Each structure stands twice: as C-alpha cells, then as structure tokens.
Amino acid sequence: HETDEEFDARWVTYFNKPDIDAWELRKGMNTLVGYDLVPEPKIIDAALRACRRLNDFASAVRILEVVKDKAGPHKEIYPYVIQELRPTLNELGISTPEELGLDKV
Amino acid sequence: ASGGGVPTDEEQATGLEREVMLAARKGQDPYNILAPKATSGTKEDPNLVPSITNKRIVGCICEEDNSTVIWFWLHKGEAQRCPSCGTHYKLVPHQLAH
Amino acid sequence: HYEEGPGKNIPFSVENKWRLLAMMTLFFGSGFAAPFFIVRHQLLKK
Amino acid sequence: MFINRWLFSTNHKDIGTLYLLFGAWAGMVGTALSLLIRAELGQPGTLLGDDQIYNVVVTAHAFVMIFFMVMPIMIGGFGNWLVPLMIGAPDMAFPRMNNMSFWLLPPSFLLLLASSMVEAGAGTGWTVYPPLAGNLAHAGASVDLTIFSLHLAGVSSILGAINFITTIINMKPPAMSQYQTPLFVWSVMITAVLLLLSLPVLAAGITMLLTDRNLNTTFFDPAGGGDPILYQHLFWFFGHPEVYILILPGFGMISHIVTYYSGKKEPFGYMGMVWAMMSIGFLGFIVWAHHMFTVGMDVDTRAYFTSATMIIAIPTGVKVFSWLATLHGGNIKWSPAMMWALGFIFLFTVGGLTGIVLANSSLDIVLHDTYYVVAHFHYVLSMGAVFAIMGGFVHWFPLFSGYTLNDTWAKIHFAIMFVGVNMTFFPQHFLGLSGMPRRYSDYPDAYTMWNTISSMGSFISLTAVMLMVFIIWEAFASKREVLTVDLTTTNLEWLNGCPPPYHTFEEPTYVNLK
Amino acid sequence: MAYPMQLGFQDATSPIMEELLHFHDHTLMIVFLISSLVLYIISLMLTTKLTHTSTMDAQEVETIWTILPAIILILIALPSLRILYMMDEINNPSLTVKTMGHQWYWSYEYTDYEDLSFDSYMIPTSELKPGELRLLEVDNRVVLPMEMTIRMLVSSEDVLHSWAVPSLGLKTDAIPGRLNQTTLMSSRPGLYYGQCSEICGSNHSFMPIVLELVPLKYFEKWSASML
Amino acid sequence: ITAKPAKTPTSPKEQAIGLSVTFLSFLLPAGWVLYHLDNYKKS
Amino acid sequence: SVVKSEDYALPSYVDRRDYPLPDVAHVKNLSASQKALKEKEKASWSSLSIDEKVELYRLKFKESFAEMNRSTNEWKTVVGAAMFFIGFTALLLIWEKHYVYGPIPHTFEEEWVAKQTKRMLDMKVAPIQGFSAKWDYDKNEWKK
Amino acid sequence: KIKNYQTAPFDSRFPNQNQTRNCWQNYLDFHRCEKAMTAKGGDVSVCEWYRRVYKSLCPISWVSTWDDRRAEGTFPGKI
Amino acid sequence: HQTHAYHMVNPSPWPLTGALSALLMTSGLTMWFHFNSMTLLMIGLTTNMLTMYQWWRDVIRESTFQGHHTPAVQKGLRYGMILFIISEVLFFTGFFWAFYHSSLAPTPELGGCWPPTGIHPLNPLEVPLLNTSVLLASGVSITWAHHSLMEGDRKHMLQALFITITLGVYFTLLQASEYYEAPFTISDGVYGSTFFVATGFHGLHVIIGSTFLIVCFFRQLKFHFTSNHHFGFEAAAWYWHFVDVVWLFLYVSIYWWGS
Amino acid sequence: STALAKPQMRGLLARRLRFHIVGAFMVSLGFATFYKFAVAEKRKKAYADFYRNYDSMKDFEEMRKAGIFQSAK
Amino acid sequence: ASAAKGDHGGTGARTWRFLTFGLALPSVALCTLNSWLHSGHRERPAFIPYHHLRIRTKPFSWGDGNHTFFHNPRVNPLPTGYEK
Amino acid sequence: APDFHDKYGNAVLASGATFCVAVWVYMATQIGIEWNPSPVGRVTPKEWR
Amino acid sequence: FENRVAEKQKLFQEDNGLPVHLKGGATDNILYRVTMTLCLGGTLYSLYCLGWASFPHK
C-alpha cells in the first residue's frame, strides 16, 4: 500500500470534494472507521467541512463521537483531536458531544 | 443402413424447455441462464438490472476474485450504489411472457 | 396457497400458548420418557 | 392441505423444519439414555441389575445421538434451510427425493427402538463388532433390526449427499464461482462427499454381518476362514470419515456465527478455511486404523497411522486460529449464539488435543478402550457438535420462525450447559489415565469419586435441556416478531425476511461478471 | 492398581511403562500450553474496544500457524516413534504363557515344559476376604517370574476380549482364530491388576486379570504344584 | 436484531407455569420408573 | 416513526459504533418546528442554540454513542439464575439418592477400607509416587 | 543333543504380533516329520524341535481340534 | 411466475410410500429370518415396485410431456446419476476388500491356501469367459444404440437396444445356470461367501440395469426420446457400463486370480 | 492552559496484539520451565532415586512375610 | 494399444454397428462354442466333512433349513454328505 | 427507566448464589454420599490377614 | 407405431390444477389409493408384529 502521508492526503481529498453528496459522506466515514487508526485531525477537519456543505450538523457531532470511540482506552487521543480542531469547531459553530450533553449515558 | 423416425427438439420440446430453446435462438435470456456483463457502473452508465417486479436482489462481486459477495435489494427508481464499492445499479422492470 | 408468515410455516399450532405447552410437553416428554420405559420393559421380561 | 404440505413436501424449508423437529425429539431420547448410563455409574454397585440392558442403553445412546440427532439437525435441518438461501437457489436440485431422505428416518428410528424391545436388545456397542454381534452371542432379531436401521439411515444420507452436491455445484448464480460461496455451503458440500464415499462401505460391512448371521456366510467367522478384524476395517473406514461428517457442518456454522457477532463482513482467510476443510476431508480417509492399535497390528503400520493422524492437526489449527483472527478487531456482540461459538472454539480445541494424545499408538495401548477415549470424543464430538448446533439454533431461530428468543434466558441456558458438560466429562480424563475401562456397568472402588462427580454433572446438563424446551415455548408463546436484522449485505439467507416466503428466489438474484 | 482420587497413570511396573510416563509428561505439557494459549487469545480478542474490521491479509500469518504446528507435531512424533520401535525390538523371552478369553473369565496355559492350565474367575463381592478388592481379585492368579522377559500370547475361545494390565503398559485384543503376541517384564515383585478391555457382553465388567510376580524359584515350585 | 413487542406477552407468572409444566413433563415419568426399579428388578 | 414488517426490504436505521452514519435518519416525518429548525440549519451553526443542536442530533440519531455503549446489570440476572438452576439440580440429586439408590457395597465400610489400605501398603501399590510412596514404612505412619 | 530348550525363540519368518501362522507351521512340520520318520523306518526323535515349539505356542484347544480332525480325516492342511 | 430455469416439483406422495416400503422390506426380512413368515416382505416388495413405477412415471410426465427438463435441470440429473454410480462403486469396493483380505492371507481353517482345501473353482475359461464376452459385446451394442439415436435412426436404435437387452438376459440366464451347477455354495466358508455375495449383488445390478434398458426400449417405441434430449437413455448406458466394468473386476479377481 | 502533546494514533490494535503475543510467549517459556522442574524432572528423579539402591528380593521377602502371595508363604 | 483394426475416420452408428456384428457378436459365438463343448458333467469328488465347508450356524429360512437356495443334489452335499 | 435487571438483578444474584451453595453443601455432606476420598493422611491401616 | 407424444403433452399440460401424479386421470387415483393403502396397512401390521415380538412366548 502507501505511506501514512499518502493515506491521509487521499482521505483529505475524498472529503474535500466540493459536491460530495450525503451517500459519499456516510460511505467515507463508515469505511474510515474500519481501519486500525484514529483519523488524523486534518481528515476529520475535511469531513466536518463536508458536513457543513451538506447542511448536516448532526453528522458533524457524530463524527466527533466516533473519533472518541475509535481511541478505545487511549483517553489522551480524543482531547488532543478536539484541541487540534478547535479553530474549525469555532469557525463552523460545531458543538462537541460533551458541550451538548451527549456524552452522558 | 441409415433411416429416420426420431423426433427433434424443434418438433417435440415443450413447456419451459421449449421457451428456453426458442429464446436462446433469438439471443435472449428470460430465464437467467447467463451471467450479465457489467457496465462501467457510473451514475451515467449504471448496471441495468431487469426485473418482473419492483425490486430485485443484487449481489455485487466488487473486485475480481473477491470471495465476499455484497447483497442488497435494488428498488425501482433512482439508481442505487453497492454499499461496499459504490458501483451503480438501476432497476429496469417488467413483463416476460407476452 | 399455503399460509405464510410467523406461526404458519410449521406443522403445529401456536395459536394458543397453553395448548402449545401441552403439545410440546407431550412431544419432548414422550421422547425423554421412552428409554425409561424401554428399560422398564426389558427388566420386566426377566 | 396439511398432508400435502407436511407429508408430501417438495419444499427445502419445510423439509428442513421436519428434520429439526425430528432431531430435537431424537436429542431427548439420546439425553435420557445418557442419563441412564450415568445413573448406573453414579454410585458403586449395580442400579439396573442387568448389564445386558446397560450395554443396550450405551449402544442406543450413541446411535441416537449420531444418526438421529446430529446428522439430521446439521445436514437435514440447517443444510436444507440454509444452503439454497445462501446461494440464491429456488430449492434443492431433487426436491422430491429430498423428502424421501427425511421420511426414511422415522422408520430407521422405529427399527432401532424395535431392536431394543425384542429379545434382550443389541448390547453390542455402536461398533457392532462380531462375534459379540453374531448369531451365537446375540441370537435373535435385535442386531438384525439394528443393521436394517443403519441401512435406512445410510440410504437417507447417501441420497441427501447426492442432492446437496448436485445443488451446490449446479444451482449457484451463473456469476458465482465455488470460491464465492459461503463457508457453511462449503462445509455441507465436503460433508456430503464424505457421506457419499464412506456410507457404502459401512453398508457393505453390515450387510456381510447380516449374511453371516442369517445366510451362513463366514466373512467374519474364523471357522469358515473369515476374520473379525475385517469387519473392524470396513466399519472404521466409514467410522473415521463419520466423525469428520459430524463436525464439518458445525465448523461451517461456527465460521458464520463468529463472523456475524464480530461485526465482520467476512471470515478471516476464506481460502485457507476452504483449504482446511478439504484437507481434513481428504486426510479423514487415510487414518481409520487408529481405532485398531490394540488388535495386533505391525509396527510400521502403527507408525504410519500415528503420523497421518497427527497431520490433521495442521489444517484444523488453521481454522481455529482463523476464527480467533475473525474475532480480532471485531465490534463484539455478546449474543447467546456468540457464547456458544466461543465455548465451541475452546472445548473443541481441548478435545482435539486429547485426540492427538490418542494418535500416538504407544500411549493408545494404555488409553484404548478406557474413559480417556470417552473424554476425547465427548469434548470434540458431543460438546463440539452440540455447541455448534445450539449456537446455530439460537442464531437462526428468528429466521426460521419469525420470532425472537429471550436473550437473557438463552444466556442462562448456555451458562448451565457449560458447567454441566465440563463437570460431566472433565473427570473422565482422570478415570481413563488411571485405567478405568469404557463400556463398564460398575468399577473398582478406587474410581468412585470421579464417577460420582461425572454423574452429578450429567444432571446439570439435564436441567439445561429442560430449560431449553421452556425457552422455545416462551418464544412461541410471546410472539415477538422480527423487524430488522443487521449485516444482511453479507448474510443472504436473512434478506428475504423472517420467515422467508414459501417460495424464495422465484426471480433469481442479479450478479454481474464484470 | 489405581488408588482413590488418582489423576494420572498408575506407577510404572515395567521399563516400557516408565518410558510412556515420560512421553506422556512431554505431550501433556504441549497440550496444556496450546489449550491455554487458545483460551488466552480468546480472552485477548474479546477485551478491547479497539476495532479493525476492514479486510485483513492472511498469507503471512498462515505461514506461522502451519509451520509452528508442524514443528510441534514432529517434536511429539520423534519420542513417540522411538518408544514404538523400542517396544517392537527383538527381546528373546525365557517363557511363553498363553491366555484365552471366554465369556466371562480368562484361562491360562503354560506349556513350554509340562501341560499346566487353569481358569481364572473374579471373586464375587460376597466372597471377598477382608481387605480384598471388589471386582479385581481372582481365584487363580497368573504367577510369573519377576525380572524376566515373558512372551504372552492372547486369543479367545468365543467373542472378542482384550487382555490388559495398565501398570505394565499392556493391552492386547483377544480374537478367536488369531494368536496375538506381546512381551511383559516386571522390574518388581508384587500383584498387578487389569480388566477385560473389549466389550464382550453382559459380564464385560467382571473378568479381571491379576499377575503375581515372584522370584523364579517360587514360580518353578508353584508351576510344579499346579499340574 | 430488532423486534416488535410481544403480540401475546408472557408474564412472569405465566413463565413460572410454563417452566414448571415443562420440568414436570421430563421429571415425573422418569421419576416414576426409577422410583419403582426394584419393583421391576424382582417382578 | 413506526417500523413495520413490510419494510424489511428497505434501508433501515441502526445504532452501531462501527457504522456511525446509518442509511436513514432516525426521524423521517418532521413537525413544523422541526422543519423550520432544518431550514435554520442551512445558516451558520453558531446561530443555533444548544437545545436546537441537540434536537438536530436527535432527529438524525436515536441513541448517542454513550447511550448505545452503556453497560447493564444483565450479568447479575444471568449468573444468579444459572446458580438457582444449578441449585435446583442438587434437589434432583438428593431425590435420586433418597429414592433410587440403595446401599453401596460393603467394601466401603470403614473397617474394610482400613484393612484394604493396609493390604495395598503390604503389596506396595504405587511405591514410586502414587500411594505407598506416601507411607513411611520405618515410622509406620503417613509421611508428613 | 543341542537342547536346553526354554521357550520358542524369535523366528524371522514370523516377526509380528499375529503368531497364528507360527503355531500352524510348527504343528504341520512336526506331523509331516513324524509321518516321514514313522514311514521310512526312522525315529521320531528327530522331530522333537517342532514338537516343542508348537506345544509352547499353540493354544491347547487348537492342538486338540487339529488332532481330532486328523483322526477324522478332515484336517485341511497337507501332511 | 419463476424466471429461473429449475424445476419446482408438485407435492408428491412417493417419497413417503418409498420410505414406508423400506420399513416393510426390512421389517419383512426380519420377519422372514426370525418369525418364519414372508407376509410383510411381500407387501414391502410390492409397495416398493409401485413406488418406483409411479415416481419414475411422473419424471417422464414432467419431462417428455410437460417440458420441465431445461438444460440446467438435465445437467443436475447428470451429476446426480454420476454421484449415484460412485456410491455403488464404493459399495462393491467393500466386497472386493473382503475378498482380497480373505484370499491373500488364507487362515489355517482353510488349509492355509487359496482356494481352500475342498473348493473346486469354476474354470474361468468356460462359462465365466462366455459371460465376459457377452457383457463386453453388450457395451458395444449399447454404444451403437446411442449413436443411432443421436443420428435420428429409430429402427437401428431399437435393434441395437434390443440386442443389448438380449445380451443382458443371456448373461443372467448363464449366471443362474452357473449358480445351480456350482459344486460349492454360499455356506462353503469364505470362498463361497465372497463368491456368491459379490457376484450375487453384481447379478442384481445386471437385472436392474436390464430393467432400465427395457424401460428405455419402451420409451423409445413411444417416441419419447429426441435426437438431442434422451437423458434416461444416457443414464441407463452409464449404469450399464458400470455393470460391465464391475464384472471385469470380478472376473479378473474372483474367477481368474482367485482360482 | 497547556496544549496536549500529539499521541500515537495509528495501529493501536496491532500494537496491543504484538505486545500480548510476546507476553504470551514469555509466559509459555516460564510455564515450560516450571513444568519440567515440577513434573517432568520430578518424575525422572523419583524413578531414579527409587531404583538406585532398590533390592527386589528384599521387597519380595517383605511382601511374602505380609501374606500377600498365592505362590509364596 | 490400437487393437489391430483401423477406422477412426468417424466413430458413428455405422462404425459401432460394424463392431457389433463384425467383432462383438462373433466373439460371443466363439465363446458359446468353446463353452458348449467343455460342458458335460464331470465326476463329483469324494465327500469329506470338512468343518470350514457346509457351514450351518443358523438354519436357512426356507425348506428344511439345511438346503442352500440353489441346492443341486448332484454336486452339493449336505453336512452329512451327498443326498440319496 | 429501570429494566428487570436494574430492579431484580442484585436479589437474583444474591439469592441464587446463597441457594446454590446451601443445597450443594447439604447434598455433599448430609445425605450419605460416599465420595471415597484418598486414604492418605486419613485412614489408619488395620491388620487384614 | 405412431408418435402420440403431442396428445400426452396436451393432457398433462391441461390447466386443471391436478398434481402430476394424478393428472393422467382416474386410474392414477386408483393406483395411488392401492399404493397408500398397502403402505399404511402394512405399517400398521408391522407395529402389530413388533408388539407380538416384544414379549416372550416361551
């Protein structure tokens, strides 16, 4: 296959397609979470902006949830990713699952 | 030596056997004996899936020699995509026996 | 044609759960009881 | 209509239902016989006061569990229900012959019950070795009725094997190669090939036993120049393929259950799993004389059979590791069917390993005809096959019936069964190593402790069996109808709904070649 | 004989049986390791929220899990076959004894020199002398010289039986019309017990074997007294 | 899997009845035979 | 919102951590406020309130990840019930001992066992490890 | 003369577990020899080795059945 | 309305009647062997024959008369017949195993020789050689019948098939005469046991295959077969060649090598 | 506040697997060593010590005097 | 092998009929001559009541229990010898 | 909303374990079952001849 | 003889709802009733014989 950098760029390019449709957004996220990795912030950034172009706030929040879920017991990964996305979250007005209370069982 | 008196299929085949024989003669396959050949499967050139009803099961062998087949109902209407590979399919319904 | 659907693709009725309990009791209970009674039969012959 | 549907069937699903009902009823008979065995052994001394009856009970227990519970459920029941659905086929190749394979089984079973009711029964062992099974040591009708029972069961399975091979080879979608068919379908094809080749040899051997008993032949009688060991070779030439026949459709179901509840689209290493089942099936024909290491066999023959037997561990280990690798990375759903399959993987492995111990003919001299052999096959066969059957049953019951089980009750059932079988059979290893013979109605006093524990274990599995009947009742009593099922894109048998219509795939699936 | 709560093999009475004990220890270590490894990996597969569900490539790992099992089998087969061929090796016995199975008792023939033969039946439980063993004692034991290589020939006069003495590592089926040979050598005097080991009908459980191993000179005088 | 609520719910009391009857159907006939074994063994 | 049997062939909703974006929305028929909320969603999400963001989430999804992933007390019911039925099994075994089994052989009487044990030590049963190996023949007692 | 018999020695013609043919061959050899000696006016003493070997190896009931069938004229081996 | 080519069969009583005929035949053999009575066995043989007649009658109705045997259905029947013949090969293999086991290691009770003391085998160059030429010749004539059918020649198909059947009958009568004339019997130890059970099952298969050819003869007389579609004739020919090949193995093994 | 350092994000499942398979190998080595000392060598040494100065005639004489034999009183 | 004949321009109906009448049936005619020329009854051997022959472990299910199914009094002795 | 397990699970667990232990201990110790454990360290050997 | 297969094809394809084993007409029904009567009556007779054979008659 490919280097880490090539892999990440391919996924950035996938979600950055201007006219990506709702089916392709879902297909992308549902495929990406099959891999043994937590997606790089730059990939998540492009997917959240795809959500914006698709007028889909709910899926943006769900994407943040699945980043947390893919980290499993590695509790340091999700706050790092949120930290790195904070300018994007602010620019797009995306609230985190925690800010919405959706992390409580 | 050499005589006749044995009927031929043309003379004597009947029922479904005869339907298959006569359709094969016309190069048609109403009883699904052949594997269909794929199109490019894009949104502009989707695989055309005939049906005598409004939905039909598709199995998609996404890549040659995949052992996993991906199965789904294809409904009449807008073309749908394989949930594994994205290739497009569109149902073309109806008829058979005139 | 034949009945289709849950509860209909089977040779026994599930229309009443107590009649069903009695049928299943007799069915599985007769299989379970048979060897005990065959042993009894062989012991009673000598 | 009732007679037309259920006695004149030509429908693969209804026939599958008949086999499941038959096999379940047979499983009760077999369980009762097993409880009588362990009641006789549960304390020192005699319970029945009649060891000929004890031997008849042991013999019947094995024939019932093998020919009337496992094979009908796995091949007749799950095979008929699932194989046509998994390949998109509208029925079996020979839908009317299919119905005769089913209806031969109640008469076969009646002949076996007749054998135990007339005279003093056939107290032979399920091996039916002459001369004990001959017309001097077992005069009268019982052994002949047993022979005919096996004849009818053999014809049923040979014809079913023809049907399954033909269906699987001939009735797939034209684009689907054999390497695009699901592993359960492969496991049934390979089981059928084994049935096809092995049952005719058994039929030859038991027919010779029949003529020795009734037509004054002497195939197995030294007075006429015959040989009792010839019967053993013909019996075990069938009998080793038979134990792989008993487990292979279980391996198929386990591959599907583990894949499904791991949330995977596919088992790990599909072609390795195909290779492994074909290799097991092939090696299964060249190992039979490990059932005969104490009959007076030359040393080079013992060396060969020891080595060829052990080789089977290699393809079997590929399947075990591949199931583990299918779990690996899964989003595990801890459903009751998953618990049965995980129990299978562990307990089958224990039993397989004690089989490898027995394969060493030098150790088998001391372990042959002891409870170590009984412990081996109740782990691999009794537990392996039963746990795969229970896992398949719980997994596919909503497909077949349209109704759900109570999952909590099903987990309770698993837990009870798991304790019971392990308490019953694990101490039998000690009994075997310390030299207790199998097929005994009583034992020297030193063997009391493990026999006592083993018999208490058998009652725990009884409680599990009674609970299972209640759990099926409760599901049919409550009528929770299925709405949605996950992973249909890689589990075609679910895609026509629950239960599927009488006729499915009247319009076949569309599959492209590209 | 076995003793209560026994877990493993009876103590070895012959050098072949000591070989088998060491070979069983070796094989059982391997059995325990593999079964525990499988159980451990199961627990490992099931104890993480981390996932990986895309298609996995299998050929690298299938090399490991065919080669390593093949090596383990060879490591069992090598000592296994060594014992097998060592047992088969030429021994030259000093004595031949025949045993014939019957429903349901054993007979013995010692006909190298004189015509000595007798039948050997289980002692009924009601007739046991204080401290004798239920289902194991016989009226006439198989007296044999200790520390000597003995040829046993085994056959039957009716159905199949099997002549077994676990502490000597012996089990040889008794087949009418066939004369099966095995060799026996006890390192020690004493009483060594076995039981019929091929189902032979309603008293299969009740036709035991008892060997009585003594110095040659006692065996000679016992033989003479049994004529 | 998802399912509809039961069309004919089986309450805890109904379950206790079904379980009790199921268990007695296995236990009573075998129990009767085994209780009387000695009446058979010397009949 | 009602899921019917006759919808089996259509894409359906699922909550699965490994399938985070399901094929359809949780809520298919919207109220008039929900419809207007969906229009507002086409403008800056910074202008949505927290309650409105939560409502948009619950229109798309049924359970959150935290909810769908929660642990339960079912294990207590399973383990306790299994123990109850295993306890019930012992009642069957008490009945069997009382009503089915007669006396065991006289060879299990204490005095028989004491004599049989001496005779096993006299014949040196399992003298290397198993039995007589544990008897001290010099001190006439079991080894400590 | 060349004695000190203890038991039948290993015989490379019959090296395996089934010794039926070893018993049979020595029974035949003994009676063939005894027949040749008794006929040609010799002494059966030269037959003794085969006698000792078959007595050591053969079940008493085999020997007794074969002896009866020789006396009956139904023994199927050639002597 | 289906749009596959496979055959959904009408609900049928013949599987059940066939299974019950099996119960009656086996029960009946038990009653004959142990309770001195032929009654159940005669009922079972009669119901077995009725079952076979009606079942195969219906297959002819389904195919010749109703057209249900599409090429896919016919291909499945080809596989089914091949697999059936394989199972019959393995059945005979058990009897050849029994024969070689007993004859390669003859026991002392036999005199330690094969053939046993007191057995006078048939001369393999007399009637057994004639039987061999008869079955080989019938393999040649049935091949002539097959080619005449494919070439559309009704009269010569009938003549060749008649000749084939006549040869099968001749074999059966010859073997019946040999059985009567044989100086050994099935009770003459393992020589008679292997001889009569192995050639007896073979003779049963000759009668079965002859019957199958006779069914084909009457179907041909009624014009059922076309020049391209005649699977019952192909199946009967495959079975007939199987019967011929089993005979050659019997001849070489039991009559010749075993003499 | 303080930024968080970037953590390992890739191959976490594979990493866990390799760590624990190595651990399992080490434990298996430990067990083999325990077993060959607590079972296998223990057995060889028991038999070797038993027979090193074993007197079969003395053993027999003790059994004979205790009355166990039919052939020797 | 190639036998020693030839054709192979086409193995159709005319060729197989040629083989049927030209080779197969002449062969049967020759073997029929060979057989019905070595026929004629041969002198039956002395009766010897060998214990591996004329086996009777159970009476047969027909006749008097002591006659085989295709019993021929000329050449099949009973356990006690040839019939009167 | 509490399900069956939230409401009854602690009771089912506690009662089931208590009952299971009590009845097996009673069965194993109070009803005359002879386990025939090892004589080693427990039986005083007694003259038999 | 003459080829009458077409007449049989018309008969067995007649749209009368009969299953193939009865579609030849009244003689099919008679043969079916004979077969099933012998099978079921024989099966009942075999059960009677089991009952008889299950007990000693000294």
Ligand SMILES: CCCCCCCCCCCCCCCCCC(=O)OCC(COC(=O)CCCCCCCCCCCCCCCCC)OC(=O)CCCCCCCCCCCCCCCCC
């Ligand atoms: C295996 C399936 C599950 C089994 C569950 C039920 C069994 C209970 C746990 C079960 C605990 C499993 C460990 C084995 C028992 C250890 C006893 C032993 O040292 O036995 C050694 C030998 C003979 O050894 C000897 O010559 C020396 C004897 C030393 C005496 C010391 C005093 C011992 C006191 C009495 C102990 C009572 C034993 C327990 C009595 C058991 C009553 C049921 O016996 C044998 O060969 C028996 C072994 C048969 C071969 C099959 C093994 C398959 C692997 C089992 C799973 C392991 C991974 C899971 C690890 C365990 C996960 C569960």
Ligand code: HEA
């Ligand atoms: C499901 C049925 C089943 C199965 C699958 C098996 C599988 C095996 N069995 Fe057996 N067996 C029986 C049912 C079965 N058996 C029965 C019923 C009998 C008794 C018949 C009678 O007498 O009544 C019997 C008897 C029997 C005997 C005769 C013992 C005697 O009578 O003295 C032997 C001897 O070799 C044997 C060996 C094996 C072996 C080596 C396997 C192998 O196929 C097992 C392979 C599996 C593994 C080894 C575990 C998984 C593998 C790994 C985890 C990989 C790594 C492993 C290693 C390197 C070892 N079995």
Ligand SMILES: CCCCC/C=C\C/C=C\C/C=C\C/C=C\CCCC(=O)O[C@H](COC(=O)CCCCCCCCCCCCCCCCC)COP(=O)(O)OCCN
């Ligand atoms: C020209 C060839 C003709 C062959 C057929 C002849 C009539 C028999 C009818 C059925 C044949 C079926 C199978 C054959 C099985 C038994 C072998 C019999 C072959 C035969 O006919 O052997 C004859 C004896 O037959 C006997 O016992 C007669 C015995 C008749 C009763 C047979 C009992 C049936 C037992 C069959 C069980 C079959 C189980 C099949 C299982 C199939 C798979 C499930 C030999 O006669 P003889 O007087 O001993 O010697 C001749 C001396 N002059």
Ligand SMILES: CCCCCC/C=C/CCCCCCCCCC(=O)O[C@H](COC(=O)CCCCCCCCCCCCCCC)COP(=O)(O)OC[C@@H](O)CO
């Ligand atoms: C004394 C006499 C009785 C003795 C007892 C034994 C009885 C003898 C039974 C003889 C077997 C007769 C079989 C007749 C089958 C007729 C039906 C048939 O041949 O059916 C054909 C299908 O083949 C098919 O089912 C193929 C069906 C294959 C059947 C093979 C049967 C072998 C039976 C063996 C049974 C015993 C086994 C051995 C016992 C140890 C129909 O297709 P076509 O021919 O293409 O026609 C269609 C065309 O017309 C269209 O143009």
Ligand SMILES: CCCCCCCCCCO[C@@H]1O[C@H](CO)[C@@H](O[C@H]2O[C@H](CO)[C@@H](O)[C@H](O)[C@H]2O)[C@H](O)[C@H]1O
């Ligand atoms: C392995 C399978 C078996 C597992 C354990 C079975 C558990 C037993 C359940 C109870 O069975 C019943 O027990 C009664 C005794 O408790 C019996 O009554 C018997 O005893 C009563 C009291 O002595 C009398 O009143 C009755 O008439 C007399 O039949 C009764 O017949 C029997 O059905």
Ligand code: CUA
């Ligand atoms: Cu003699 Cu078992």
Ligand SMILES: [Cu+2]
């Ligand atoms: Cu085997």
Ligand SMILES: [Mg+2]
């Ligand atoms: Mg054995």
Ligand code: NA
């Ligand atoms: Na007992």
Ligand SMILES: [Zn+2]
């Ligand atoms: Zn695809």
